[PDB]
């Protein structure tokens, strides 16, 4: 008799969840979406605890329904990562320590319900890397505690890679800070700009596959040479990843009244140097001489002349949504400004990624996961030194369930590659015969 109402409530909850997470309409706020899921979960928990006095069957039913309707959205983990990242960011409504802890506990509980935890882990790593690069950390100890709690909730086997990556990132950040401090004590420098030395290895970091190249002016060239010399004087032979794709610096540059510190991006740095040294530079010539991305050029144009009237000292032709070739602009420092330092506001749009960019990132993550699964598949066969056609598939699926979803194609590819690369002493023709070589 207790069963009969379970079906009805499960159906109602499933319909409500499907309606809430439906794709009808666009521009859904990830923060509002996660808030709605949290509110629904809280309402269900209150209903279960109040009237159903913590019944096991109802808990199992609601857990099954949540697992069913949670993975209906492929992009859902990314919004979860954004919600758990911006909330931890400073200035998020001034959340108290208890409130932050409760929000993190709820986020960890939801992360337990996600079927595909690999995408969630990748998104969390990317968000953590972005927050670290944002140079706006609220509490590093709080972030470490949240990471440890999430790893404990998700399981040691599943989150060992995430914990190792977080420890490696923390160690790399500490080493970079120590190296910068030593170089400063080194009784030397390369131009007096802000020590934004991102000389860190990209072995286990979420570095972009493409490294933009920025036209280094004579001052930027001297700064790069000095930085390279200091790095050689710190670790000879070793060369960490210090690409200028996201290079940042803080220096005072005058284009030819009041002294101001200019803050520009890596792509905008070439344009500023061209305007600081030369008088008239065409947009096409500047882009050709710097090879800046079209999106980067558009963002720089929007943040330079299309922004606030107080910082609108140049009238680009045309300074609108459209981009016109040969846009002649001049950096007029005589214009009246309010802020002492001219810092370009960061382009922080709504949480999310471009559809082609998101698809490419998902494809890369899936390829990496498939490669890791293929590599780990041979480990199961090597541990038992023997496996069958179904036995190997079952063993692979045992280790490829929490992190991702096992596929027969991946198992077949791993079996073929074991014979091909001679890593394992198996035979592609004889599936029953399986052994280990390496």
């Amino acid at each position: 008799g207790l069963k009969t109402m379970c079906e009805c409530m499960s159906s109602y909850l499933r319909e409500q969840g499907k309606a809430l997470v439906s794709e009808e309409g666009e521009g859904k706020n990830p923060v509002d979406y996660i808030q709605g899921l949290l509110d629904l979960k809280s309402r269900f928990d209150r209903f279960l605890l109040e009237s159903f006095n913590n019944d096991r069957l109802f808990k199992q039913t609601i857990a099954g329904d949540f697992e069913y309707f949670l993975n209906l959205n492929s992009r859902s983990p990314e919004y979860l990562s954004l919600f758990i990242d911006d909330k931890l960011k400073k200035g998020v409504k001034g959340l108290t320590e208890q409130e932050v802890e409760t929000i993190l506990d709820k986020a960890m509980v939801l992360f337990r319900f996600m079927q595909e935890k690999d995408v969630f882990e990748r998104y969390y790593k990317q968000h953590l890397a972005r927050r670290l690069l944002t140079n706006k950390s609220v509490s590093d100890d709080s972030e470490k505690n949240m990471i440890s709690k999430l790893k404990t909730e998700c399981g040691c086997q599943f989150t060992s890679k995430l914990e190792g990556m977080f420890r490696d990132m923390s160690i790399s950040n500490t080493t970079m800070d120590e190296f910068r401090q030593h170089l400063q004590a080194t009784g030397v420098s390369l131009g007096g700009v802000d020590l934004t030395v991102r000389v860190l290895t990209t072995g286990y970091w979420p570095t972009q596959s493409a490294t933009p190249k920025c036209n280094i002016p004579p001052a930027p060239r001297h700064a790069f040479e000095i930085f390279r010399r200091f790095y050689l004087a710190k670790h000879s032979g070793r060369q960490l990843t210090l690409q200028h794709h996201m290079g940042s610096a803080d220096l005072n540059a005058t284009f030819y009244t009041r002294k101001h510190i200019l803050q520009v991006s890596t792509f905008q740095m070439t344009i500023l140097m061209l305007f600081n040294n030369r008088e008239k530079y065409t947009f096409e010539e500047i882009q050709q001489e710097t090879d800046i991305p079209e999106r980067e050029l558009v963002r720089a144009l929007q943040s330079l002349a299309c922004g606030k009237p107080t910082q609108r000292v140049l009238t680009k032709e045309p300074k609108s949504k459209e981009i016109e070739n040969g846009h002649i602009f001049t950096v007029n420092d005589q214009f009246t400004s309010k802020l002492h330092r001219v810092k370009i506001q960061t382009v922080a749009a709504k949480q999310g990624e471009s559809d082609p960019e998101r698809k490419e990132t998902r494809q890369k993550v899936d390829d990496d996961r498939k490669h890791e699964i293929e590599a780990a598949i041979v480990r199961i066969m090597k541990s038992r030194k023997k496996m069958q056609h179904n036995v190997l598939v079952a063993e692979v699926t045992q280790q490829l369930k929490a992190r991702f979803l096992p596929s027969p194609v991946v198992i077949k590819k791993r079996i073929e590659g074991l014979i091909e690369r001679e890593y394992l002493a198996r035979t592609p023709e004889d599936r029953k015969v399986y052994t280990y070589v390496a």
Binding site: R229, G237, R379, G417, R421, E422, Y423, A438
Partner: protein, 60 residues
């Protein structure tokens, strides 16, 4: 400062063939290992037969 030479064919005995199936990870001497060697020493075998000595890499 210094270029990275991980040997396109093979840096040393790796037992992984010249392929990505079996560079980013730093070597023991901080001179970088082969792409096949790094992949073999990452998660392929418990005992790394890819850099003579056991190779596990560190740092992000």
């Amino acid at each position: 400062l210094w270029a990275w030479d991980i040997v396109v064919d093979n840096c040393a005995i790796c037992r992984n063939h010249i392929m990505d199936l079996c560079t980013v990870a730093w070597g023991v001497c901080n001179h970088a290992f082969h792409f096949h060697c790094i992949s073999r020493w990452l998660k392929t075998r418990q005992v790394c037969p890819l850099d003579n000595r056991e190779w596990e890499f560190q740092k992000y």
